[PDB]
Amino acid sequence: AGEARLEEAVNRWVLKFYFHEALRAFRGSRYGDFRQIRDIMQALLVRPLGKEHTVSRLLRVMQCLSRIEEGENLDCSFDMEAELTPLESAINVLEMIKTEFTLTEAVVESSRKLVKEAAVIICIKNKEFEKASKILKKHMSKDPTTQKLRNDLLNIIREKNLAHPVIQNFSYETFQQKMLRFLESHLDDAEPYLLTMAKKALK
Amino acid sequence: GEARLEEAVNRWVLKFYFHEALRAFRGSRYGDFRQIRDIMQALLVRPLGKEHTVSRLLRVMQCLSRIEEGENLDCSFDMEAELTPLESAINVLEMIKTEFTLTEAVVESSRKLVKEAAVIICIKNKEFEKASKILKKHMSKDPTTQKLRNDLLNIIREKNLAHPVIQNFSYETFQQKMLRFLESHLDDAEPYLLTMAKKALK
């Protein structure tokens, strides 16, 4: 009751606050700060939070950014079997986000295209062509908006052509920030209660 | 201002979870305590500014953490030892004595309990050499502890785990006495986040 409902309320404020700081850190390319804040939120999620759609949505976005942040490390794994690269995992998270945010396919398709493209290109950049082909086959063979790009990538892989413009013009920093603006555009962009209270208290 | 806003919130959050940790410990909810401890640990990596109150806070939090895990001898809190968690608790207790500017006579009573408990746990885990070493280095007082210290010396040599002193020992009773000791040197006031939550939910 009014002892556990107090704990749940504060835990929600604390979570929502660090979520905001995590986004600010990511936005400023401060990924060391992001990873530290992520670890705080990780320890926080096991606490009672009640059942809000808002903390669930929060965590999915937080999951996507985490996988994108580690996206250039193909030796890193988010599943206990190391089957998937972080960007393959990010694709799975994005679909959960589309569902939970009740998004239209037209709204999601452009940014999903970005993640798929990045997943393959990183593999190519690391000369992991078998992996590139697999990801390409599993994520672009049956996707209407990716066909034009899918065609460029097959040829790049088969010719082992790292000097192709599609590869050379790719910027992972640019990719990350594009994904963030997409995710932030579907977020309640209001300042967290704790920050607002701190602004009053220090005023 | 900038950055000083983060430190302010970080302090409120630390102090709040400190308050919850004590509440969980008081209700013998050690699972909840451990989880809250892990949150506070993850926070230590962030900027907090520098308050004397949080230093004192963290020391108490350190003592309770070692006491909570005191029965797990495969657990280690220091990276050079070889110290059992309750041995670490003894070291923390001395930091608490200094930093709280407490007198030896006030601290003396509660430290005996930790020394008593540390030795008995080694005995319960059949770690007699460790038990002897701890006994020899710490419980070596002489006055009111003579009768008990002699009991422990005899038990270790005979490996008599069935001795009443070993059988009648209650760790739950020990923990709660330690918590109450530590709380007796603590302010007292409700954490700001809790107060705000009260005015928010009425």
């Binding site: 850190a25 390319s29 401060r30 990924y31 060391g32 700060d33 992001f34 530290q36 | 401890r37 892990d38 506070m40 640990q41 230590l44 990596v45 962030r46 900027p47 907090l48 230093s55 963290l58 939090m61 350190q62 953490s65 895990e69 657990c75 280690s76 809190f77 968690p85």
Partner: peptide
Amino acid sequence: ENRELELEAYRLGP
């Protein structure tokens, strides 16, 4: 991409 400010010795966990 910092972004601490402390050091350990305030270690709570093991």
